[PDB]
Amino acid sequence: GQPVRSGEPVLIKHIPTCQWLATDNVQYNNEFGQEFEVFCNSYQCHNKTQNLIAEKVGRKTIETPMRNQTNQNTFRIVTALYP
Amino acid sequence: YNLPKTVPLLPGHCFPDHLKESHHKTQQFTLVNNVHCEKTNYIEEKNDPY
Amino acid sequence: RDEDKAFSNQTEHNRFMLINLERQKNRQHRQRMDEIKEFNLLAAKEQKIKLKHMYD
Amino acid sequence: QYAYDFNPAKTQSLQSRPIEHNKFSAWTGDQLYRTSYGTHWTSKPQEPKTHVPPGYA
Amino acid sequence: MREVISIHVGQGGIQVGNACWELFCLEHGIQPDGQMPSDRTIGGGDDAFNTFFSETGAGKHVPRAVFLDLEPTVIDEVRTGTYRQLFHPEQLISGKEDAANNFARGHYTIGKEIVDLCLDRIRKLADNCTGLQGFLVFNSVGGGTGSGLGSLLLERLSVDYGKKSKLGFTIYPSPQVSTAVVEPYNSILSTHSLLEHTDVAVMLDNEAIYDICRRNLDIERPTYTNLNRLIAQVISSLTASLRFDGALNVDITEFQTNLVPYPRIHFMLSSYAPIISAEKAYHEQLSVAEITNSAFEPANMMAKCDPRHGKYMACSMMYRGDVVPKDVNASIATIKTKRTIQFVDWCPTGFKVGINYQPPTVVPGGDLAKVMRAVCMISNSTAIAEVFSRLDHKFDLMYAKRAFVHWYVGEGMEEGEFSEAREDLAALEKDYEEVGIET
Amino acid sequence: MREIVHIQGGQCGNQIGAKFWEVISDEHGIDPTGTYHGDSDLQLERINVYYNEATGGRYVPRAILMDLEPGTMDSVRAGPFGQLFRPDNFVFGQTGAGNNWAKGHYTEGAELIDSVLDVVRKEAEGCDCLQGFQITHSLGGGTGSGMGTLLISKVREEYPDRIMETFSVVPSPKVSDTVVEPYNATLSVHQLVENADECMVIDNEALYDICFRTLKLTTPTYGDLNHLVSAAMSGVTCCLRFPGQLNSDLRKLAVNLIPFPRLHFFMIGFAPLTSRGSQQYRALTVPELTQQMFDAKNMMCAADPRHGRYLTASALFRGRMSTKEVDEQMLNVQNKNSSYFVEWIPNNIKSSICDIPPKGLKMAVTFVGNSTAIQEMFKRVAEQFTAMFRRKAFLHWYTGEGMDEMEFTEAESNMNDLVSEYQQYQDATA
Amino acid sequence: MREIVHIQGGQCGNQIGAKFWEVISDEHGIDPTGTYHGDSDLQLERINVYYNEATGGRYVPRAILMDLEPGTMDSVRAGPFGQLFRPDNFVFGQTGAGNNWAKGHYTEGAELIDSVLDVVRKEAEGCDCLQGFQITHSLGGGTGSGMGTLLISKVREEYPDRIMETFSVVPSPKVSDTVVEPYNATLSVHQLVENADECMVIDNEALYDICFRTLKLTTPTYGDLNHLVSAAMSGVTCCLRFPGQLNSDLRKLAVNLIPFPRLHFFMIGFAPLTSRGSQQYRALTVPELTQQMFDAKNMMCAADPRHGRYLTASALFRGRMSTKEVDEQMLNVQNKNSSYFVEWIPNNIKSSICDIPPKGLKMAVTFVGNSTAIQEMFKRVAEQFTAMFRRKAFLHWYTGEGMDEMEFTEAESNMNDLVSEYQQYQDATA
Amino acid sequence: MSLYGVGLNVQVDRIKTEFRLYVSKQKGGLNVRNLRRIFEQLDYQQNGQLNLDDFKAGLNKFGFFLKNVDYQCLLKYFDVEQNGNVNYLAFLSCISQTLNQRRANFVLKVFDSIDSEQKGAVHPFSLAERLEVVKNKDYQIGSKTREQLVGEYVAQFHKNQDGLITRDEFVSYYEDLGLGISSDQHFIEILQTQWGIKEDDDLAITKEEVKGIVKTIRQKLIQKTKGANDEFLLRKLFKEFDISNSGFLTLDEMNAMLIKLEIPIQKRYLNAVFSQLDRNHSGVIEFEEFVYYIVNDPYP
Ligand SMILES: Nc1nc2c(ncn2[C@@H]2O[C@H](COP(=O)(O)OP(=O)(O)OP(=O)(O)O)[C@@H](O)[C@H]2O)c(=O)[nH]1
Ligand SMILES: Nc1nc2c(ncn2[C@@H]2O[C@H](COP(=O)(O)OP(=O)(O)O)[C@@H](O)[C@H]2O)c(=O)[nH]1
Ligand SMILES: Nc1nc2c(ncn2[C@@H]2O[C@H](COP(=O)(O)OP(=O)(O)O)[C@@H](O)[C@H]2O)c(=O)[nH]1
Ligand SMILES: [Mg+2]
């Protein structure tokens, strides 16, 4: 419910899949030189957190995320410098 | 719509909080000469030129 | 109108959950801050009584 | 968003609300109004008498 | 209207009183003059101090305490010390000649000229109180005027007031550590005298506290000032329910009604947790589950007695801080399950819990750490029978040759008191044995 | 018309009454200063049941608070909504009870109860047409279990026609809050079975279980426990204050719930209750309400209902709902679990409907049921009492006030006979 | 309306269940939040089969997640699509089975299954007319095998009339994960024969072969393997949720597939399957589909059906098509390969048509058949069991908690009769 | 009933439904426009504010009665400035429908028929001439005081400063009349009988008809040739006659193309499926999109 500012890192996620848009150092060949690929994947941290036992005791809730992510999901919107 | 601005109290939703600096109890009720009496707090006036 | 009543009434429960979750998130933040408070003074007092034990 | 509030309509206590003043006679617009006559034609205290009949005692 | 009047007799009582009364002054915000801080300027003054302090009408506060001693040295220190203007001038009674470690001196010959003066002062303080809950007494059993006057005052109070509750924080001699030579003689004589005159007695021997400071507070050379600070904390938690609101309040009168199965069985030993320095406080989380377990450790007790050698008849514990009724219940259930701790058969329900909101206060220059939870536990058990037996053995060792008895018989007491006092103690030794066997 | 006066004693009684009066003030839209600020007309028609009227148009509850010590009274006066109670309704002593039934019933409460009896007499004569009394007290405490029981007895011979209601916090040995609790519990039960018209047992273990497994909140408090108790209290009497499809007061509840006069011990439960993190998945339907109603873990007592047979039960519904749906659910739950209901009475469930739901909700219900499974608590209390009385430990404290062991023996025998006759109907068959 | 509940046991069942619910939600267009966003109205007509309605119009799956240790369910909750499952449907212990059949069936399963049995009983009560159950678990694990098969026994006793399905992944001996595989695989089969209405055998070797040879995937992962299982699972009940020219539920398949009650072990296949580099060059038609359907390399089991005789078979068709070609294709393949079909049952093929194809494809076919070649899988399991059992290796763990060798003897004894029963109904001729 | 939060919206909705039901049931001389012309007499100063007593008196005069509590909810909702007085203008702003499109279509065409000289305004006597002609066959053209004698059939409307009525009010009066009547067929019959004009569209193609038509198309193709084929067959017509090779399909070409494969769709039916298929609205559709929708679509 808060306005989105231009410039800071953000996240873009698909609503039917809950998968964050991502891009990695994966080579791809095309007429426009060499460029990488864009796909959807959640680059979450590998370490597991005992969320289920936390829920039953009553310490945390589902909507609040518990696992960090890697910066491959970070995107930024860039606008024009001059009017 | 008309959504309530504040949470309504419910069997487990009041949640009293007790993180104060000092939990002191004031002696407001006193029994003297086998007669009940209480302090006159919340009632005092201050002054006026009346 | 029955469909409208269902949507209008369930929205109250939606707001209801958000209030509780937000304030509960507030309470833990304050209580955690009070735990930082305790070890703040204790850390100082450890370096305090260390010198006092050397003398007397 | 916010917690639960106790006082509705923002009713300030009369303790700080202005000061006592000369309205002690608010009810006594009809206090020396007897009802043996009266409340038969009038509802307000009767004027001081100017004339009396014989044997007024 | 919940006032307690404390009695401090002997050097042990007075030196405990100094540490005990500096905590109350700081806890309720009173400067050493009895006056509130000059600047202050908050408003809405709370008269929670009425439990211990009394208002003079305009200005200072005067404690509801009395100090007794026959040697003038320790009192003169108080009258010259930091708190000279706090106590009333004529509520510090001082004698001229010491009792000199003799029970008879302070009970028959020279203690009768002082006991009249104190009873006059006690009546004036009691007449001032409107809701007097009871009396607290502090005395050292292994001393002359400590046990002499202490026994005389308790006897006089029994007929002067009667049903008023009286609590006793005695200081019994250590099993092996000793400062005098004739402690067993006046230990029994005092114990027999106070056997039928006190309501609740707590053992406060010194060697246990020496071990606690070394083990927990990392102090290798403690002093009596350190010990008196720990004892005062026990008192503060014990009476904290009368002046700080809590979820479940407890009263002084609700101690002798639960921890005393029989009139002759009123001896009990106390424990306190967490007694910890900030060395280990920075690491431990100090949860309510952890503190309630540490209170039952025999090494953490305030008396040189092992509860593992006897049964538990009743236990009362008080929680202060941010405790929750959830975890108090859960941890207590675990204690009942533990096989290492067992209760007597005829007492299936064996606890009493008190909850208070005020966290413990910290004294500047003190040794304890600042915490959020604390528990004080008072338990009556059968294991106290061993301290009497060991104290009995030393008395029988001396009394065979009638040593030191001429120092007593010539000071107004008869020879027969030694036999009956020993006779009375002997019955109590296996009296604890009869109550502890299964039906 | 058919108003009820609220009288309470003891620490637990004072706290429960404070929470209940706060809940009632919120429900009726009364500000902390006592001035009506409701928005609908229905919140003013029946305000006379609980609130009196003073000058200036303010309302003061007809509540009486008693205690041998003013500690909890002092604590509750300074709290929120503490200004509603008039100072003349506060009666207090100077000594205290000390968790002693003898002290609270013979030597202190007996000499102190004159003033509170005067106060309750004044209130009863002041009210237009009294409907009954209700009690909140603790059986395990001294002053409560003594003075409240003695007051119950006295007001019972004085008003033999009015109804009686009690909310007793019976002790559970798991939380051994007081070592001398069996004596007080058994004596209070012996006194209560003779006079009390309704009894509702409340257990801290059941409240803890509810607050831990249902609400899923990390820091339970006596505030939350008292809120649960107060919601249960208001649910049973909502229909007396608001209109509905079927009206049912306390007299009708007793009539439709108690089979025999000595069987007047019930268990209560409130629905719906859900966690913050699980409310988004549940629905709001009468079948869900009634399936949570009969869940064993939802009860406010230590007694487990599926170990016994439901003699009679009653439900009081709040909100706009359908008679079809409610009575079909009642019939279905009665038919599918025939082993859980006694056989020689058909249709042993009563339904009541109120059109006004609690604020912030659309449907609610309160369940009161007389089940033969409560005998477990009585048997456990009696066995602890007899085990601790064989050695007659702690008996001298009670004997010092002139009591005699003949009364103890008679109370134990009455409790045993109550347990025997209460178990007899469990195996009874036609 | 003939809805089905889902039970997920073991580590494999949790992973199989996670992907299956992703496909079903996709097939009905359900977002991870729970709000319907489909394109056509047919996706909402029969949504009640798998989803329960909640507040706000969201849908929740009626699936129960069960495991002794919550390590596996911990990862699935935090990942995508971890929000659909209601938190009340997760049950977990504190120890874990650790590939010990008896520990998960006698010691830990016994004291834990009370909770999960209550939950599934509630779910079956809520539905108006239950249609059947389905269980996904593993016979090579501890929690999947022991506590998983015990719950089957309990619900079978309580619901003796409903149909039950199991998607059992019996591990293969070519490459194995657990060294105690023969024990807990053998015991589970003995308990599964007399309680499961149908059995759906899945082997890891077949899954790996399809990906490498048919899909030509150089780096397959369990995510790919779980999808192939999930695709077949939805195809079995596709006609129950969508309209079609011929209707067939789970019960109808049971009638036309099981000649005798003990012969209820099927083997599955799914068509079509092609790589991305070959989609353009292949035209999808009914003759093309039925050719891959009967190919032995396509089926989900390591058992080669060419070594036995097809007792019965059933084919489910998805997608719009006429009926003449479907009828004749089943006829022609029956005539030309008569050597692979037993004779004493004429026309042993079942055909069904559904007109809603899966997303991304125009036509799909799910194949379930009863073949005597499945006896070979039992033979090698008994072969490995007796080789390990003759030395009593690893037996101290099984008999350390009350299990006796008498159980092992009958477990293998029951297997021999099943192997013999299939062989007798393979050479018999009219 | 416990109007704590959303309850205000529910109860006022109940009141609005009750009022609509009442007015629709009586169906007769009473009208919503009759209510507004009653309020201003009680308004006195035209402030737009009325107290609870006057508001209750006015509603009771119309013949509408509610609960004592129900009146409180209306005041609480419609006292926007919290002066203790309801806003009858706001009350009449609600419980007013926007009129159905078919009703709007019929009322607009009648006004167009009356106003053949396209100014958007109609002289009052011109209307009253028509209302009198339809009512009898012997009225005759001439009358003694025809203007004032026949103007009583009109002036239920209102006129602007010029003296002519506007199209805006002509619709406005009829949509006010559309609250006492809740039957579309009865409304159309009343209007046509009043105005001597009965012209409307027969029907519109429905989603069920579109689904049936498209199922007919997709099934007819399958019968031809084999499963892998018929995509080439569909593309073959476009190859045979798409001269410009642009790749766009027109309505005329699609109609003729479907004529070739023994599928003679009606023009109205063909328009409906054509309009449903495209969303760009230029009248041209890519052939690839058409063949995709026809062949490769999981849903009907
Ligand atoms: N724990 C503790 N014990 C003390 C303290 N001061 C004195 N004692 C005890 O007091 C006992 C001896 O008594 P005294 O200190 O001489 O004072 P007394 O009890 O009045 O005896 P008299 O000398 O006859 O007056 C010693 O055995 C100590 O155990 C103290 O500060 N802390
Ligand atoms: N539910 C609930 N129980 C309480 C509360 N306060 C006290 N209790 C219970 O009351 C018991 C003690 O009662 P007590 O204070 O001795 O009663 P009293 O002697 O009449 O004042 C404890 O076991 C508590 O469980 C409360 O606010 N809520
Ligand atoms: N098809 C499939 N099999 C799996 C998956 N994860 C594990 N397995 C198989 O499960 C077997 C191990 O089962 P195990 O975890 O011990 O079962 P549990 O003890 O009941 O939880 C291995 O042989 C794996 O091949 C999966 O995601 N898909
Ligand atoms: Mg000395």
Numbering used by the authors:
A (entry chain 0N): 198 to 280
B (entry chain 6R): 3 to 52
C (entry chain 2W): 225 to 280
D (entry chain 3A): 3 to 59
E (entry chain LK): 1 to 439
F (entry chain LN), G (entry chain KN): 1 to 430
H (entry chain 4C): 1 to 300
Study authors write:
The inner (luminal) wall of the DMT is supported by an intricate network of microtubule inner proteins (MIPs). The assembly and stability of the DMTs are indispensable for the ciliary function as they serve as a scaffold for numerous ciliary complexes, the force transducers for ciliary bending, and tracks for intraflagellar transport.
The single-particle cryo-EM analyses of the DMT from wild-type (WT) and K40R cells allowed us to obtain a 48-nm repeat structure with a global resolution of 4.1 and 3.7 Å. In addition, we obtained the focused refined DMT structures at 3.2–3.6 Å resolution of the K40R strain, in which lysine residue 40 of α-tubulin is mutated to arginine to prevent acetylation. The mild phenotype might be because Tetrahymena has the species-specific protein OJ2, which might have a redundant role in ciliary assembly.
